[PDB]
Each structure stands twice: as structure tokens, then as C-alpha cells.
């Protein structure tokens, strides 16, 4: 998180004792100063995607974590929306499909 203050107005001990704050980044004795260019170039940012570590995108490959299909790799055909998903599950004979919630399976 970034803060802008002056130590005379509110002290660094008071900022350090704020409910929900671990610590200043120090590198040594004093807390670090980020230059104004970093604040300026983190004004407009976040360009690329909705990148999403460890949440499955459709058109990908997953695994199943519970139930009677636990241990079965699956293809996203078409999740129903932003509520559940539908999966092309494998078997040792024939692949099936199922509309399941998002707790009983996780991405590979």
C-alpha cells in the first residue's frame, strides 16, 4: 500500500500502529522513500488483462477435488455464467459432461 504523509503531522510510529498495517518497508533504519515518478507512473497502470492466478478460465484444463469423480481431468465447454460451471469430464471409456459448482473442482 502507498501512503502520503509528513512525519511532523502524523508520526511514523502512529502509522506503524494503525489497525491493519504490518510495517513500513525499511531496507535498513529509516522507512523507504519512493520517488514521485513511481507514484506518477502508478497513477495510470493495470493495462493487460483480468489475469487471475489460480482461478479457471473457460477453454482450459482442470482437475476434480471431491465427489465420485475426484481425480478426473476436465475440459471447459461452457460455464453457465458467473455462478457455476459445466465440465467435460474424462473416464477410462467415454467422456461425460456435468453442471457443477466451483468448489468440487480446481484448476490444474
Amino acid at each position: 500500500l502507498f501512503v502520503e504523509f509528513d512525519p511532523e503531522v502524523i508520526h511514523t510510529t502512529t502509522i506503524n500502529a494503525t489497525r491493519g498495517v504490518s510495517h513500513f518497508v525499511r531496507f535498513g533504519a529509516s522507512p523507504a522513500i519512493v520517488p514521485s515518478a513511481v507514484i506518477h507512473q502508478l497513477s495510470v497502470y493495470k493495462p493487460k488483462d483480468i489475469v487471475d492466478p489460480a482461478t479457471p478460465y473457460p477453454g482450459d484444463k482442470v482437475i476434480i477435488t471431491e465427489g465420485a469423480f475426484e481425480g478426473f481431468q476436465a475440459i471447459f465447454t461452457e460455464p453457465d455464467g458467473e455462478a457455476r460451471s459445466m465440465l467435460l469430464l474424462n473416464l477410462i471409456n467415454k467422456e461425460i459432461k456435468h453442471s457443477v459448482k466451483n468448489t468440487e473442482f480446481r484448476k490444474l
Partner: protein, 1341 residues
């Protein structure tokens, strides 16, 4: 005069000093501390009121709302103590506090709040104290040991030699507060003074003076006296007080009035100072060279320029004198800096200072205290004005202020909790005074520097921590909360308070498990002064002095009851009479001595007050007048045992028992033993198992009564009266009239505690020691507990001992015991194991407790019922099954395809493994008690319902017996009313017993009392209803459990271990012994009257181990049983009471002066025969601690019996039948069975289980483990040539897995050969080193 039960068996009392103070209640430390903690205490000192009035009223950050406090109250506990120990919950009370919230408006400092509210908030539970001084925390019964920490206040410490490696001493000065930051001043070998706070970095000590808004001139005015130089006609004549001439050499001429007083070259004598002070010599003329080393005092600016000529604390020279002379400054102030008396420490410390003003001083202190974060004026000022000066973050106690004033020789003993400017200045001045010579350093072990925390203080501190955390939470909720919808529980949280107080009572270095196998062990574990704990010193660091007995321990802390081992002298026990001062210090009683007649009044002295007066000895010879019969008597002045005058003394010791404790005031003949064997005797007497038949120590000290009555393992009668009904389980007493309440008719019902488990797996058991229908007095014992006999204390049993070598079977310290001991079952004791079986909810379904058990038959099921739980009374051995528990076995992990297969086609597994609760190895016994506990969401099987109905009928039957026999006593009072006032006798027995009131009685106080008892009876009706229903609720419900367990079954076995070659018996004197051979009766050495001896000790244990007191105990016990045999002869060939009372009076007169005799002409002619029935097993003799029986009285008592005065009887051998030469000592020694039993220490293992991280045998006995063939034994085998023994020892037998499997196969093949291989833990070593960044390998073949 005595009781009626003191006339059961009155002990023969030696003892010459008439006692003035009776022995106090021994558990007063614990109970008085906790009663000080919880008390509805006005004015707020000391207790919970002090913590609340410290923390309340809560206001927010000017948020126009302020919570205030009214009162507190603790409800009743929901669980009584017996069902608490059985059930496993705490024994605690709810804390119900009535807080009051008032909420201001915006801009109402004096304006009335718009809303008030006052509810009763529940803030957790605090555990109460059982009336014996114990807690019950989670089933277990735990004791808090009183601590012993450094008192709050200033201390001046030497550290004389270890510093500097040069022999120069330093002198530091530590300010220890009760709560807040520490503070230390100290020197350095450059003679500069330094300060440090909380053992941080070192600053020069005057910078904190600059923090206190002091200039350089003010500091120099404080720490130095002025020496005046005046510019005058020539050469700058000087005021010279002759006192400053102490110990100097005249390097210049000392003259005035044209008279050379002291010449240059010579030193200045005190004669010279007296001549100058007599001649009134003040102004003297100096050379200009004398100021060339001196230091200017204050700042002088030149008035022409306004610029500084010289700064303060600058050494002067001739050019500076030429500057100040031409300026106009005629006056020069200087500093007396001489190395003998007034050193220049502060001036040099100012020269070291890198600062000048207050701001740079506060910046430097802030960079010391909290580094890294940037120094700013506001934060640094807030820091230093909160470090020592705020009521919140710094507080000396009142104890701290009293010590901090007494050490500074201040006048008051009250003050502020914070420090001040003059406090720090006086500490630095006193430190400099110690540096200069006046005053001396305070030693640390002095018990006036050394204070006792107890239960109340430590629990109050933890409750204070809980309160400050909850007020931070409340001030968080108050500045953010909405109004008006929150009552004072959305702000509050009972979680931190209960979490803190249960972490203290559960997990602390002092809330420790009670050593409970003895009445004595309880009463000397509660009276314990630990030096360890938080704020205390650790075991494996310190030291010598804190382990060592110091002269202030006389009568405060016991010198001989301390454990040998790693902590000697740290876990010191407290003396008998030693109370605790209101400041927490150790006060001990003394007899006030106004003059030659010693006064009969007592007066308590702390440790610092002892050194001022001069205290007499306890056994100082006085005769009926208070007059010391000598003019010179042993006393002690300042820890110095020296002989002083007859009238210079001020105090006298109260009793001669006061130096020691109850662990070793029960050792008779203590004055005759070495201190080592007294220590071993006390620490073993704490460890004796309660035998099956308590057997009255013949050689006692009289303190057995106080240990029995005070330690609550006997049933002392609350109100005296008449026995109505004695059964083996309850005792019901009808109360005498003058101790009786008018309402609530009242009979005292004492439910005894029968055979049940103690904390050391011994048996605690109370037995009724009174008859049916016997007068008992208030304060008299009614039930003898474990190790007690008729209200006395009886740990071991007293046996016929003989001191001789008997064919080597008692070689080093072994003890050879007859078969008469093991036949009589007189050391046969009872041990009890609690075995639990838990039913956890696991995978593949939870587990059944059914009797349907695989792979076994009726061989185990023959002792199980319909439910699978063993019957009460089953005589089980090792290897049986007590609770049959079965598990869902098969562990297949079938595929998801097979999961769909078993899900559609519907086939269960239905395989199972035995996991029943089995008897451990070696043990036998008897199931005496089965408890079944069940989670409330779980159904009950049939034996659980059977025990539930059993407990329900027992509860209803107990309450019905309470109501019926209380109704019988109530009707007996109604009958006592109905004797007079309209007697209608045959009108009474026709109508039923319910309405005895409606017979003829007028409008008097008797019918008023009948209506009192009638409303009592209707109260008992409604109370019977509500208590039966509440007890049905308690029995019918399921209890809370650990999350994840269904039902718990707890079986209580009861093994009866007798005695065998291998156990450890010992006396009271420090004579330990492994009982070696359990001989038959015949081989024993019998005397010429035919009587076999029982136990044959070793005489070589007497000259080395200098415990000569066991021999006097042997002879005096022999005299005691001689009197007992004579009474048995006079009573067996049975006579009338006259000759018996003559012989009993001869037994109780005995020559010299005692405190006893007896008023034996008064014992009703039946209390003599009952006393002779209790004396026929030997006459009990009180030999007190240091005022005991002399030799000649033992000889005179042996002459009262027909025994020889020598003490030694000729003995024959049972083998050869012929007389031993040189007749030997036989007598009765009271020998104890310690609970280090050989069938608990014995263990063996061929091949059991193997540890997991390294394939090695396990450690312990309870886990079936092997012996640690340790490091030094490997060195011993290297010291032989034993290579192959070592090779199979640390590779095959221990570690190499394929090696030991091939070895076991070779041994059953009959082949003795090992495949050596490589040990596995070495491979684990290689994987750990290789799991670093280190390559380790094995090279070429």
C-alpha cells in the same frame, strides 16, 4: 484441659519452653492472597476494585461518550468440586459486572448525557479457589506457587572484580519499577557516568538531565559545591573553607594576617584545619597558577560585547583570567574537584556529552529508545514525557515508593507512582555518594530487598492485562459505534479476559501440578517460595549466591527443606511462623522485650527491621520471671551471632520451631542430625505413599496435629455436637445448642470421600474415626483421611529395627526385612490407574464401542457385558480387554469408477479391526469405577443408560436422605418446642408428623418459631423440587467435549502393590534404602524373650552419614513400646482402673519440667480405660524440634519400662541359634514406604516399535522403548577393545533396518552373526547436510 477426642490418645510431651504463640493456620498464604484478590472491598485496596478503578471510567478520543463503572459481583459456580473433578471442566465462577454507559452530546463537557444505560455485563469466568488452597483447572488439581522476585525500588550493586580486568570497581544503580520501563545508571573505568534504559545502548548520564529541562549551570549547581575566587588588590584572593583542605599537599603558601599558618610543601592535618577554624581564617591569597587546572562554574559573557568569554564547565588558564579580569567579572566561581572526597564525575560526563540543549537531548534519547524511525520534536517529547511520568505506562507500586524512599533516607513512605526530577537527581547523587565513600551498596539476597508474589497479585496482573486489552477494544468501538442501539456488550468482549486468565492458570511456570501423595506434600507444596518464574532467574544460569543461605533467612524461609538437584535454594520452602507483611515482605514473629522481664506479647518483624534491633535466642535460659538467668546471652545484631548483655536486647524468638518448616518440623531429634541428612529426610518425607493402615508415629514432634488439621484431607467439624449417625460414607451430627442457629434447625452432614484417585495415582480415602453417639467439639476432626490416625499424621509405620550387619544383605544402604512385615499387609498400599477410551469421529464412518470384536472369542468377551464395557469388580490382569472398540478397517481406497460401482449397486465394506482399550502390561487389579461421557448429539447405548439411571437414583436417594434426616432434626426442634407451652402428649402421636404445630400453644415466641420452621419446611419442599429437577438436568444432559470425539469411557483400576525386593523404604532422618531380602520369620534375629525383629538396618550408615538422631529415635521408640507392652500386660491380665491410672500417671509425670502433666484424676473411670485401649500399641511421645528430650530423660523412661538403660539388647541368630557377641541396638523406628516402586522402574524390551524419522528404538517405558546406550558408554566400549559389541550395538540393535531383520532371522535360525551395513540415521545426516547447500558424498570402493 483437652477435648473429648484429645482424651482418646494424648501424646507424652517432652518440651521445656512454655510456648506463647500457637501454630497458625498453615495455608494462610494461599487463602489470604485469594481472599485479598476477590473481595467486595471498599476504598479499592487491594483487589479487583483496584484494577477496575485503574481502568474505569472508559472515555474515547473526545467522542462525547463515556462508559463508567458501578460494581461487580461473582455468581455461584455452576459445578460443585466433586463433579468438577470428575467431569473435567474448570471450577470457576461467572464474573457479573454492572457497567453504566452514559453518552454525551456534541459540546457537552458539563452537559448532561442524553441517555444513560446500566446493564449487568458478563466478562468471562475466573477460577475460584477450593477451601484447601487448590484449583481445579481441567479436571486436574493445580497449585500456584508463591514467587520471590526483586522488590520494586532502587538498588546499588557492586560488581567489584569481573569488570575492567584491572581490579577497579564500578558502581551501578538500578531503578526497578513494578510496571513500566527499567532504568539503570552506571559508571565506566574512565570515571564517566552513564545511563541506560531497558538494557539498551549506553548514553552519558547527564543527557537525561538535559531531558529534564536543566541547563549546564543548574546541573553544576546540583552536583557540586561552590569554591569562590574573587578578584581583589592582587593575585585574586580566595575564600577557602578549611574543610576543603582535607588530605591535600600545600603546593602554595597557606597564610593570612601576616601569619604563615600552613607552609608550602607539607600536608594539611586536622590540627591545621582546627587551628584555621579556631582563628577564623577565610580569605587567603593564591598564585595565578592555582586556577590553571580548575574549572569555571557558570557562563560569563563580556558586557561590552555580549559575547561569551568562557562557557560553563571549562578548565581555566592565565589568558582566560586576563580576559575576565579586564572584563569586570571580579567574582569567579569554581568547583571543588578532589579525587578523595568530591570527584569530578559530572563535569567529565558533561564533557563527553555530544549535546548542548534540551531538543538535541530528546532527539538522542529517541534515537536510543526507538531507532530507525525519524526523530521529530512531538514524538520525542511525547516519548520522554510518557517514559517515567505518566500514570499509564509507568508505575512504581506503593511497595516501590516505600523502598525507593527508604533507600534514599527519605522521610515519607507514601508518594506518587510516577518518578519526578528530584527522584532521578537523588538517585544520581546517592550513586555518587557511594562512589565517594559514604554509604554502602545493598546486597541482593537480603530479604528486605526481596518480595513475594502470590495468587492474588499474579492473577490480578493477568486480569489487568485482560482489562487493558478490552478497554482498547471498547475505545475502538466507542468512537465508531452508533447511538442509541448498542448496550455494553457490542463494545465489550469476554474473550480476551478469559483467554488471559486461563492462559495464566493453565500454562504458566507457577500454575503447576500439585504434588499430591501425602498430607504433608500438599501442605508443603502450597507453602512454597519459588525463585523461578517470570521476572525471576532461570535454573541453568544462576548461580551461587541465590542458591546460598543468607543470614536473613532466620525464621522467614526454611534453611533445610530445599531440593537437592539442579535447583537447590531456588524452590525454598517457607518457615512455620513466617507470615507476609502487607507490602509483601516476609515478617516473622518475635517476643517484644521491654526489660529484664521478657514480655508475653508478640511483634512481627520484617527483614530490614531485624538488623536494627538485637534479638535473643529461642532457648535462652529463663526461669518463671522473664529474667535471663545469666547476664550474657547469645543474640544476634546484624546477622552476627554474638553474645550481648542482659539488658541490651530488644526482642526474643517466639518458639524454637520457628527457624524450620512443616516438612522438617516433623522430623524428631532434628538438633542431632547433620543438615545434609535433615534435607534428605524432609525431601523424602514429602514422598511417602499412604499405606493401608495408618500407624501413629511413636516418636513425633507434636506438629502432626497442625499438619493434619490444617491440610484439608480430614473432615474437621464445623459446628460441634453429638453424633447422630456414622456410616462408612457419611457422618451425620446433631448440633449442640449454644453453637446453633435459631432458624434453619440444622444438622451437619459430612459426606466422606471414599476410594478415589489422587494426582500421583495413589488412593485418597477418609474413614470415620468416631463412634455412634459421641460428643464432639467444634474444630475437632471427624474423619481420618489418607496417612492420618485419630487426627494425627501417620505416613509410614513404626517397626522393630535392629542395627547390625546380617550376612551382607544390607551392604551399602540396603534394608533387610522380615516376613512378619509382608504378612501383616502393613506396607501393602493401593494404587489407582485411570484408563480412558475415546471414540472419535473418523473416516469411513465413526467407530463402535460394541462387543462384536473380530478375531477374538469368548476368552475376552467373558468379562464384558451387553454393551462392551467391563463390569465393575472384574479382577483383570495384563492383556485383557476392558472397553471393546472397533474400527472401520479395509483401507482399500477404491477408485472413483469403483466408487460409482458401490454407489449404484449398493454394497458396503463391512470390515473391521479391533482397537479395544486393553490393560497395560504387568498390571492387575480391580475395576472399581466406570464413567461414561457422551456428546449431546449422540445417542446412548444401554450401559450408559444404566449408569445414568444409577446416578439418577443415587441423586434422588441422596436428596431424599438429606430432606428426611433434616426433617427429622426439624421435627426434633419442633418436639423441643412442644415440651412446654401446652403439652399434649397423646394428641401428638395420633396425628401425622407433618402438623405438629396445631397442638395447643399460645401466641408466644414458641409458635413464632414453629411458623419459622414451617416456612423452612415449605422452603425445603420447593428446594427439593428445584434441586431434584436441576440434578436431573445435570445427569440427563451430555457434556461438552473436545471437538471431534463422540463418547469417552473412563475406567478406574485399583492395583494393590505390597512390597518386594527392590522397593525404597526409608526413615525420617535421611537413611534411604532399597529393601534387599524379604527374609522368612525364622531367620530373623530374635531376642531372648522370643520376639523376632522386623527390619535390620546397617550401622555403617551412622558414622559417615552423620544422622545420629535415628539412634535416639530408636531408643526412645523402644521405651515407648516398652510402656505399651507394660500397659498391654496390665490390661491383658485385666485389672481395675486404679493400678492403671497410677501407671499412666507415672508415665505422664517423668522427672523434669514439661508442659503437660495430665489432669488424670478427672477422666471419668472410662476415659482411662479408653485411653489405655489406645495406648496398648505403644505410648506416643512428642519430642519437639530443638527443645526435645535429653539423654537422661530417655534413660529415665527406659527405667520406667523394664528395658535396659543401655538401649542395647542381646540378640540370638535365627540360623545358628547362638548369641551374637557385643549386644546390639533394637528399637522402633518409624519407617516410610517411598513411592519409587521397583515394578514401576522395571522395564525390558527385545524388539518393539521403531521411531519414524530415524529407524531407532523409542524412549520411555509407557511407550515400549529401549535403553539409550549413550555417548559415554560408547566411550567406555572404546576404552576396552570391544569393537564388535559396539558394532552390533549401534548398527544392528539400533539403526540398520535390513541388518536387524536379517539378524532376527539369523537368531531364529540359530546363527549368531550380523550383517553390519550402514546405520540409517547417518543417511538422515547426509540428507540434512545435502539439504543445505553442501555437497557430501561417499567415495571409492
Amino acid at each position: 484441659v483437652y477435648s473429648y477426642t484429645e482424651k482418646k490418645r494424648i501424646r507424652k510431651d517432652f518440651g521445656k519452653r512454655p510456648q506463647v504463640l500457637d501454630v497458625p493456620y498453615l495455608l494462610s498464604i494461599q487463602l489470604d492472597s485469594f481472599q485479598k484478590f476477590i473481595e467486595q472491598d471498599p476504598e479499592g485496596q487491594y483487589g479487583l476494585e483496584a484494577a477496575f478503578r485503574s481502568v474505569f471510567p472508559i472515555q474515547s478520543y473526545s467522542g462525547n461518550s463515556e462508559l463508567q463503572y458501578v460494581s461487580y459481583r461473582l455468581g455461584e459456580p455452576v459445578f460443585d468440586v466433586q463433579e468438577c473433578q470428575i467431569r473435567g471442566v474448570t471450577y470457576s465462577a461467572p464474573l457479573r459486572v454492572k457497567l453504566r454507559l452514559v453518552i454525551y452530546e456534541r459540546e457537552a463537557p458539563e452537559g448532561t448525557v442524553k441517555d444513560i444505560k446500566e446493564q449487568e455485563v458478563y466478562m468471562g469466568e475466573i477460577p475460584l479457589m477450593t477451601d484447601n488452597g487448590t484449583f481445579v483447572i481441567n479436571g486436574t488439581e493445580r497449585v500456584i506457587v508463591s514467587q520471590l522476585h526483586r522488590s520494586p525500588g532502587v538498588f546499588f550493586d557492586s560488581d567489584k572484580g569481573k569488570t575492567h580486568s584491572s581490579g577497579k570497581v564500578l558502581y551501578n544503580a538500578r531503578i526497578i519499577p513494578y510496571r513500566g520501563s527499567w532504568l539503570d545508571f552506571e559508571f565506566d573505568p574512565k570515571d564517566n557516568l552513564f545511563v541506560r534504559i531497558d538494557r539498551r545502548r549506553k548514553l552519558p548520564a547527564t543527557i537525561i538531565l538535559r531531558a529534564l529541562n536543566y541547563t549546564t549551570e543548574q546541573i553544576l549547581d546540583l552536583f557540586f559545591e561552590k569554591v569562590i575566587f574573587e578578584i581583589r588588590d592582587n593575585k585574586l584572593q580566595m575564600e577557602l573553607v578549611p574543610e576543603r583542605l582535607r588530605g591535600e599537599t600545600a603546593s602554595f603558601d597557606i597564610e593570612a594576617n601576616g601569619k604563615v599558618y600552613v607552609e608550602k610543601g607539607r600536608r594539611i592535618t586536622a590540627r591545621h584545619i582546627r587551628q584555621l577554624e579556631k582563628d577564623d581564617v577565610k580569605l587567603i591569597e593564591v598564585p595565578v597558577e592555582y586556577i590553571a587546572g580548575k574549572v569555571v562554574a557558570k557562563d560569563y559573557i563580556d558586557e561590552s560585547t555580549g559575547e561569551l568569554i568562557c562557557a560553563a564547565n571549562m578548565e581555566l588558564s592565565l589568558d582566560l583570567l586576563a580576559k575576565l579580569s579586564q572584563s569586570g567579572h571580579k567574582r569567579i566561581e569554581t568547583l571543588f574537584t578532589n579525587d578523595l572526597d568530591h570527584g569530578p564525575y559530572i563535569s567529565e560526563t558533561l564533557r563527553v556529552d555530544p549535546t548542548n540543549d534540551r531538543l538535541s537531548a530528546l532527539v538522542e534519547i529517541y534515537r536510543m529508545m526507538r531507532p530507525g524511525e525519524p526523530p521529530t520534536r512531538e514524538a520525542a517529547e511525547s516519548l520522554f514525557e510518557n517514559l517515567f511520568f505518566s500514570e499509564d505506562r509507568y508505575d512504581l507500586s506503593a511497595v516501590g515508593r516505600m523502598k525507593f524512599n527508604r533507600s534514599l533516607l527519605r522521610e515519607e513512605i507514601e508518594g506518587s507512582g510516577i518518578l519526578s526530577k528530584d527522584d532521578i537527581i537523588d538517585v544520581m547523587k546517592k550513586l555518587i555518594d557511594i562512589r565517594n565513600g559514604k554509604g554502602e551498596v545493598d546486597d541482593i539476597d537480603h530479604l528486605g530487598n526481596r518480595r513475594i508474589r502470590s495468587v492474588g497479585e499474579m492473577a490480578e496482573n493477568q486480569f489487568r492485562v485482560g482489562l487493558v486489552r478490552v478497554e482498547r477494544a471498547v475505545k475502538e468501538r466507542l468512537s465508531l459505534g452508533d447511538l442509541d442501539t448498542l448496550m455494553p456488550q457490542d463494545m465489550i468482549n469476554a474473550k480476551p479476559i478469559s483467554a488471559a486468565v486461563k492462559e495464566f492458570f493453565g500454562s504458566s511456570q507457577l500454575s503447576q501440578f500439585m504434588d499430591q501423595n501425602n498430607p504433608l506434600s500438599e501442605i508443603t507444596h502450597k507453602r512454597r517460595i519459588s525463585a523461578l518464574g517470570p521476572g525471576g532467574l532461570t535454573r541453568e544460569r544462576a548461580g551461587f549466591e541465590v542458591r546460598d543461605v543468607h543470614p536473613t533467612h532466620y525464621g522467614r524461609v526454611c534453611p533445610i527443606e530445599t531440593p537437592e538437584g539442579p535447583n537447590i535454594g531456588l524452590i525454598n520452602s517457607l518457615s512455620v511462623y513466617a507470615q507476609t507483611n502487607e507490602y509483601g515482605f516476609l515478617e516473622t514473629p518475635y517476643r517484644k522485650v521491654t526489660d529484664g522481664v521478657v514480655t508475653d506479647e508478640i511483634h512481627y518483624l520484617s527483614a530490614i527491621e531485624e538488623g536494627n534491633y538485637v534479638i535473643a535466642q529461642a532457648n535462652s535460659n529463663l526461669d518463671e520471671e522473664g529474667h535471663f538467668v545469666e547476664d550474657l546471652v547469645t543474640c544476634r545484631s546484624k546477622g552476627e551471632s554474638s553474645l550481648f548483655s542482659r539488658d541490651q536486647v530488644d526482642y526474643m524468638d517466639v518458639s524454637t520451631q520457628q527457624v524450620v518448616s512443616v516438612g522438617a518440623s516433623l522430623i524428631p531429634f532434628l538438633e542431632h542430625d547433620d543438615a545434609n541428612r535433615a534435607l534428605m529426610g524432609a525431601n523424602m518425607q514429602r514422598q511417602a505413599v499412604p499405606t493401608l493402615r495408618a500407624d501413629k508415629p511413636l516418636v513425633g514432634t507434636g506438629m502432626e496435629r497442625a499438619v493434619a488439621v490444617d491440610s484439608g484431607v480430614t473432615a474437621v467439624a464445623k459446628r460441634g455436637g453429638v453424633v447422630q449417625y456414622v456410616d462408612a460414607s457419611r457422618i451425620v451430627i446433631k448440633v449442640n445448642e449454644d453453637e446453633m442457629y435459631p432458624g434453619e434447625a440444622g444438622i451437619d452432614i459430612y459426606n466422606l470421600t471414599k476410594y478415589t484417585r489422587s494426582n500421583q495415582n495413589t488412593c485418597i480415602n477418609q474413614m470415620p474415626c468416631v463412634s455412634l453417639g459421641e460428643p464432639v467439639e467444634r474444630g475437632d476432626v471427624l474423619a481420618d483421611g489418607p496417612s492420618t490416625d485419630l487426627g494425627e499424621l501417620a505416613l509410614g509405620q513404626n517397626m522393630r529395627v535392629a542395627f547390625m550387619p546380617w550376612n551382607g544383605y544390607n551392604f551399602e544402604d540396603s534394608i533387610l526385612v522380615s516376613e512378619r512385615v509382608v504378612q501383616e499387609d502393613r506396607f501393602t498400599t493401593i494404587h489407582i490407574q485411570e484408563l480412558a477410551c475415546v471414540s472419535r469421529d473418523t473416516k469411513l464412518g465413526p467407530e463402535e464401542i460394541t462387543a462384536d470384536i473380530p478375531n477374538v472369542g469368548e476368552a475376552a468377551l467373558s468379562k464384558l457385558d451387553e454393551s462392551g464395557i467391563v463390569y465393575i469388580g472384574a479382577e483383570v490382569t495384563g492383556g485383557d480387554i476392558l472397553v471393546g472398540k472397533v474400527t472401520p478397517k479395509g483401507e482399500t481406497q477404491l477408485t472413483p469408477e469403483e466408487k460409482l460401482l458401490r454407489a449404484i449397486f449398493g454394497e458396503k465394506a463391512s470390515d473391521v479391526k479391533d482397537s479395544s482399550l486393553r490393560v497395560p502390561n504387568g498390571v492387575s487389579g480391580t475395576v472399581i469405577d466406570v464413567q461414561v461421557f457422551t456428546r449431546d448429539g449422540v445417542e446412548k447405548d444401554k450401559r450408559a443408560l444404566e449408569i445414568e439411571e444409577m446416578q439418577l437414583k443415587q441423586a434422588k436417594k441422596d436428596l431424599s436422605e438429606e430432606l428426611q434426616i433434616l426433617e427429622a432434626g426439624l421435627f426434633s426442634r419442633i418436639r423441643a418446642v412442644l415440651v412446654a407451652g401446652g403439652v399434649e402428649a397423646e394428641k401428638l402421636d395420633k396425628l401425622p408428623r407433618d402438623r405438629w404445630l396445631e397442638l395447643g400453644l399460645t401466641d408466644e415466641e414458641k409458635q413464632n418459631q414453629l411458623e419459622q420452621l414451617a416456612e423452612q419446611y415449605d422452603e425445603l419442599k420447593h428446594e427439593f423440587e428445584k434441586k431434584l429437577e436441576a440434578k436431573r438436568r445435570k445427569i440427563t444432559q451430555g457434556d461438552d467435549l473436545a471437538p471431534g470425539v463422540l463418547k469417552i469411557v473412563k475406567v478406574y483400576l485399583a492395583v494393590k502393590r505390597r512390597i518386594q525386593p527392590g522397593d525404597k523404604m526409608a526413615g525420617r532422618h535421611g537413611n534411604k534404602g532399597v529393601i534387599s531380602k524379604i527374609n522368612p520369620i525364622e531367620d530373623m534375629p530374635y531376642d531372648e524373650n522370643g520376639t523376632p525383629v522386623d527390619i535390620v538396618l546397617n550401622p555403617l550408615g551412622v558414622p559417615s552419614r552423620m544422622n545420629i538422631g535415628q539412634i535416639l529415635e530408636t531408643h526412645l521408640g523402644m521405651a515407648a513400646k516398652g510402656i505399651g507392652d507394660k500397659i498391654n500386660a496390665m490390661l491383658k491380665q485385666q485389672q481395675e482402673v486404679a493400678k492403671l491410672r497410677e501407671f499412666i500417671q507415672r508415665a505422664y509425670d517423668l522427672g523434669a519440667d514439661v508442659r503437660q502433666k495430665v489432669d488424670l484424676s478427672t477422666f471419668s473411670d472410662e476415659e482411662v480405660m479408653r485411653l489405655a485401649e489406645n495406648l496398648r500399641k505403644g505410648m506416643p511421645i512428642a519430642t519437639p524440634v530443638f527443645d526435645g528430650a535429653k539423654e537422661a530423660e530417655i534413660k529415665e523412661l527406659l527405667k520406667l519400662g523394664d528395658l535396659p538403660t543401655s538401649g542395647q539388647i542381646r540378640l540370638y541368630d535365627g540360623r545358628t541359634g547362638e548369641q551374637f557377641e557385643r549386644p546390639v541396638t533394637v528399637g522402633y523406628m518409624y519407617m516410610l514406604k517411598l513411592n519409587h516402586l521397583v515394578d514401576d522402574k522395571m522395564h525390558a524390551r527385545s524388539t518393539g516399535s521403531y521411531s519414524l524419522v530415524t529407524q531407532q528404538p523409542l524412549g520411555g517405558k509407557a511407550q515400549f522403548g529401549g535403553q539409550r546406550f549413550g555417548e559415554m558408554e560408547v566411550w567406555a566400549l572404546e576404552a576396552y577393545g570391544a569393537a564388535y559389541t559396539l558394532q552390533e550395538m549401534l548398527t544392528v540393535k539400533s539403526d540398520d533396518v535390513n541388518g536387524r531383520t536379517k539378524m532376527y532371522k539369523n537368531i531364529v535360525d540359530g546363527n549368531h552373526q550380523m550383517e553390519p551395513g550402514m546405520p540409517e540415521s547417518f543417511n538422515v545426516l547426509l540428507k540434512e547436510i545435502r539439504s543445505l547447500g553442501i555437497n557430501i558424498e561417499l567415495e571409492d570402493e
